[PDB]
């Protein structure tokens, strides 16, 4: 027997290079050789977000998970003397909501705008409407909500913000979009974007990867004006000098970074950048279309996210099924792991499949053809 | 050429088993096989702290670094309606102080008690004195401060607390003590202990490993009384159900745990437990004595921590040297990495060496004999 094929929306299967890049002896975090690795990582992190070094945006890579990104933004936005604590949360599913929770836990007055139906993005006009009737210090959008597998139009939302409330910070939960979905940090005027290491970036789990715009960084570190951070580990003020030195190939110290994880992430970022982001987004699209096509049209199923449509993310598939547990158990027995629903409402009414990174790209891995064949067979009983 | 020999106080060299335990394909975090790994890890985590399952203490293993442990304790102690926000910090070096900072950043009124001289522990009578003239909600002690390489007598301090202020929570920063220093969670009445994965535990960097006493857990989750956590990722309230299920071999989800890191930690914990904690503490002692003996007596150097004495930790050595940079550079050139000072005062006046985990135990690794030979030669010029 072998290891099961991971086809859930994070963690995902790692390419050989990034996986064996984990099995490496420990390096001192301030050693010249580790400093080399992290420097590349920080610069490739901004690149992967589609941010130019000239934008003066500040990248942050630290031990934690995607979720840390929420704490980081909240803790650095809702400072002690925060002038505007109102945040407007654009919800497309479970994670948007959980982000809303995190926000509130930090002292932010949160407003939630939702879609007209589950599996859809929030209407743009409703977002601008909300952006007008009130003045939010920040607005969040979950680029791809993994619970509903819904894709939000960041280009549109970013323009509505620039148009209706330019001063409000544009925060994007890109955990399940960076690496497989078109995402333009600089172009779309994103102030804070956060992603994880185990989704489309194709790295091991254990890292929080976020990026700060010059504008937000300007706000976050203005102690005399906005006050201080009610926290510590998540303090941008404390980590900036560290990320700065590392990018300058200097090496300093606040909290020991995950050397093995950073080494792995180094390879993972190179791989997505060596072949090109656009190319990598197209592969995910091709994979996603073929698969939903097979599921929705081929097996006459219904997608949780509207399909076909630009509302359906390319990093995963969420399709309703009669008996999700049975389908999941069936695939499991045959060496394939897919996921359940995780959603306050439709939770046990559907299943979720991965198809990100090497499993989406790299047309030699039969992972997905086999996945579909199995689901196909699972619905036979 | 080869990889340099890591002889700094964290990260440390990993044994072959735990290192290759990193290079493993990703598992779904709720998959039966991963649930198996994490369950063992959580139970061996309490074991490694010397806590009996019967104590009902709750372990926490999450993505982050030792430093997260501070945020976790602070965030869960200084709740919204915290009845006693006063914390007494027992400082033996830089980290005690930084912990003090973290504490203040979270809203705690901190008092700092220090040693009479650098390289010494704080006098016990001064601690009880301070514990009497005021009533602290909690007191922290850095079991081994890596900046000064000082060891505090937890047995003594724990009795002074039980004696002078039993209600005050006993918090221990065990980041550089668990795995190489005698540490009794249950026996000494520790309420919150935090450690990291890269020190004496001999695991890769990237995990925060802490343990909560039934008593503290009682306080931390009493929302109606003490209020809520001003935070999210560090909320014990949010992670408890997760650690609980995992220990029950159930598997649930709050924030994706570092599957590869947990797998590695699994092996690392087994190894220290398979040979026995006491045995593992003696090996560290033997190694530490031999090495400081060689440095202090052999090369007539002066330890930053009082030596010989019970104030000198066994996980590292901090010795003053004429030209630290030169000694460090010299060792580096010959494939060995030791560290600088990191201390507000004596910072550039000394060096630091590791000797923890496989490099301290496993009497086949010539790492330390060679380290000394090199320092010996470094002082020849
Ligand atoms: C190494 C160390 C820390 C910091 O641990 P990180 O893993 O770098 O966050 C905190 N306390 C002590 C006593 C240490 O030795
Ligand atoms: C997977 C995911 C998260 C949580 O990431 P962790 O790494 O589990 O903390 C947050 N947001 C979205 C949109 C996700 O898909």
From Swiss-Prot, chains A, B:
* Effect of loss of the gene: Alanine:glyoxylate aminotransferase activity is reduced by 98% relative to wild-type.
Q: How does it assemble?
A: Homodimer.
Q: What else is known?
A: Present with 339 molecules/cell in log phase SD medium. Expression levels higher in stationary phase than in exponential growth phase when grown in complex medium with glucose.
**Corresponding gene?**
AGX1
Q: Does the keyword Protein biosynthesis apply?
A: no
The record's disulfide annotation reads: none
Its family remark reads: Belongs to the class-V pyridoxal-phosphate-dependent aminotransferase family.
> Which co-factor is required?
pyridoxal 5'-phosphate
One Pfam family from the record: Aminotran_5
Pathway info: Amino-acid biosynthesis; glycine biosynthesis; glycine from glyoxylate: step 1/1
Q: Name one GO molecular function term.
A: alanine-glyoxylate transaminase activity
Q: What is its EC number?
A: 2.6.1.44
**Lineage of the species this protein comes from:** Eukaryota, Fungi, Dikarya, Ascomycota, Saccharomycotina
Q: What species is given as this protein's source?
A: Saccharomyces cerevisiae (strain ATCC 204508 / S288c) (Baker's yeast)
Annotated residues for binding of substrate: 352
| Role description | Has alanine:glyoxylate aminotransferase activity.
- The source's superkingdom equals Eukaryota
GO biological process: one example: glycine biosynthetic process, by transamination of glyoxylate
- The keyword Nucleotide-binding is annotated on this UniProt entry: no
Alphabetical GO CC annotations of the entry are: cytosol; mitochondrion; peroxisome
The entry's protein name is: Alanine--glyoxylate aminotransferase 1
| Record-linked InterPro entries | Aminotrans_V_dom, PyrdxlP-dep_Trfase, PyrdxlP-dep_Trfase_major, PyrdxlP-dep_Trfase_small, SP_NH2Trfase/AEP_transaminase
The UniProt keywords, alphabetically, are: Aminotransferase, Pyridoxal phosphate, Transferase
N6-(pyridoxal phosphate)lysine PTM positions? 199
Provide the catalytic activity annotation. glyoxylate + L-alanine = glycine + pyruvate
